[PDB]
Symmetry: C2
Subunit: 323 residues, 2 copies
């Protein structure tokens, strides 16, 4: 169930069947991060520059890098020759006044254009509430079907990122949401693992908020280590596709411990698409110090970060070739 | 160019001996505008669905295929002649008249896969296009059509792209001012969307002239000689090697027929029609004012006469897409 060219592209995005990909398609989120030191709005040059510094210096240690076509094409051209390229296809964000969080592709892009821009994968982010409005989810399923069809035609892997939410729960970090997160994550993965959607890799959240798991929690506890472990097994059971974890609302150190726990519990996850934590500090150094200092930062603290992550992946991730 | 095995079989189911004699009734906004002329209340779902089912049942025995919309036309699709193929529209009807961009938008709960699953032998999509218009608008439009063309390649189903031209700065398509640029708008738009990257299998296009302003056809101001108009058809033939078929644009049945004759005499090797209002227009007033049965009798007499006389003209004017 993988064409010759999709297989070749998958291999360019991984090392020995493990995806160790660097996520840096942030647009508005990165922009705000940037305005936290300088005065005056951040220029398009700064957005594209730091993306090129991070890409040039850290992709030698990542199997691939996820970039956005709007700001990231220059960064994409200075990436390491041994690192694949994924390009984001979705517009960022969502309308906070509505609960539908409907998906929308970038206006002047298509899967064909993403492939022409050098990408080895189309990445699209979908917000999904399995329990939400039935017609909203019908429109969302139709939308992904189109993108899956596009990616089949262009013979390019389709990486579908799913971020769960609840139309009623405002705060995804609340204990209230944590009680349903396993239901949201795993049922969404079941939906979009159906063949009609054409997905090659699922980029998903871990099916639990570890900050409420015993031994990992700084405060209130809602789950035993055994209840959390079963969520990871339920997740493994929810899809036969390769899937990789994103890092959300946790520290670098907790994310790594989570990878250990995930593997311990029996999850056969196939890697990560992690970003902010690795190139975090470079954002402040870049605005304040000279870009030559952000370089040395990336060559030292930057390398240390992604290297320690790689050492953990080597003992937790499973190769997607097993599937 | 080439057709996959499945795409060719679908094209065969839409055609007879390589000629597309297709009946178009995916009208929605245009249909509601017609029904509104004949009654006070607003048209109901049941009225739209029924009138489409009547045209389908009564006239598809005389067509090689029928084009319907998924919103109101699926019941009509199920009563078409056993011998007739099916195309389904994929675009939302109409455009925003408060801006000049007329951006395309797919039906929200449909996809090429779902159109195929609904029994269609082709996906039809209408695009409003002004070759001379805003360049960023047109880049967005071109990207959109690339997506649809890719979907149809993946689902292995013919892509029928309809192009209706306009000018961002000319309000009335029927005016002499627009008539003077129409050939440019049509022919260059056909040249763009014949590029391989758009995955089009058949173009549904306007004739590249407003015949009401051509010598011999014009009742008022004459803007073009016959040789000038004929050259516009030759330019159109030279703007693509894809199959293309003409839409009627709601002219009279007689004018559309005479335009097809003129097109063939001029050198256009067009491959058929997707003809709607020129065939069934008069049934709307009858259906509204007199009801379903009276509309059946109109379709069986005047409606039949329009499509039969059209079929006779196609037999002596259209060129086959197979023999290329
Ligand atoms: Ca630890
Ligand atoms: Ca060509
Ligand atoms: Ca030609």
């Amino acid at each position: 169930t993988l064409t010759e060219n999709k297989r070749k592209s998958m291999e360019k995005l991984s090392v020995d069947g493990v995806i160790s990909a660097l996520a840096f398609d942030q647009r508005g989120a990165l922009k705000r991060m940037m305005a936290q030191h300088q005065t005056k709005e951040p220029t398009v040059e700064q957005i594209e520059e730091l993306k090129s510094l991070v890409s040039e210096e850290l992709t030698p240690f990542a199997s691939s890098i996820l970039l956005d076509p709007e700001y990231g094409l220059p960064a994409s051209r200075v990436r390491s020759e041994e690192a694949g390229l994924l390009l984001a296809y979705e517009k960022t964000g969502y309308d906070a006044t509505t609960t539908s969080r409907l998906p929308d592709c970038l206006d002047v892009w298509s899967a064909k254009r993403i492939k022409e821009a050098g990408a080895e994968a189309v990445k699209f982010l979908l917000y999904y509430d399995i329990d939400g409005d039935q017609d909203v989810n019908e429109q969302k399923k139709a939308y992904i079907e189109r993108i899956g069809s596009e990616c089949r035609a262009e013979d390019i892997p389709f990486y579908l990122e799913i971020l769960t939410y609840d139309e009623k729960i405002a705060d995804n970090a609340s204990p209230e949401f944590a009680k349903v997160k396993a239901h949201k994550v795993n049922e969404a993965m079941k939906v979009f693992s159906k063949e009609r959607f054409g997905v090659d890799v699922l980029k998903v959240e871990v099916p639990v908020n570890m900050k409420f798991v015993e031994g990992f929690a700084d405060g209130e506890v809602l789950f035993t280590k055994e209840e959390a472990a079963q969520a990871f097994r339920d997740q493994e059971a929810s899809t036969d596709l390769p899937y990789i974890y994103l890092s959300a609302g946790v520290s670098a150190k907790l994310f790594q411990d989570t990878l250990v726990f995930a593997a311990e519990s029996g999850a056969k996850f196939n890697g990560v698409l992690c970003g902010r934590a690795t190139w975090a500090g470079s954002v402040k150094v870049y605005i304040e110090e000279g870009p030559q200092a952000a370089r040395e930062w990336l060559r030292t603290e930057g390398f240390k970060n992604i290297d320690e992550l790689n050492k953990v992946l080597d003992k937790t991730a499973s190769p997607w070739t097993e599937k």
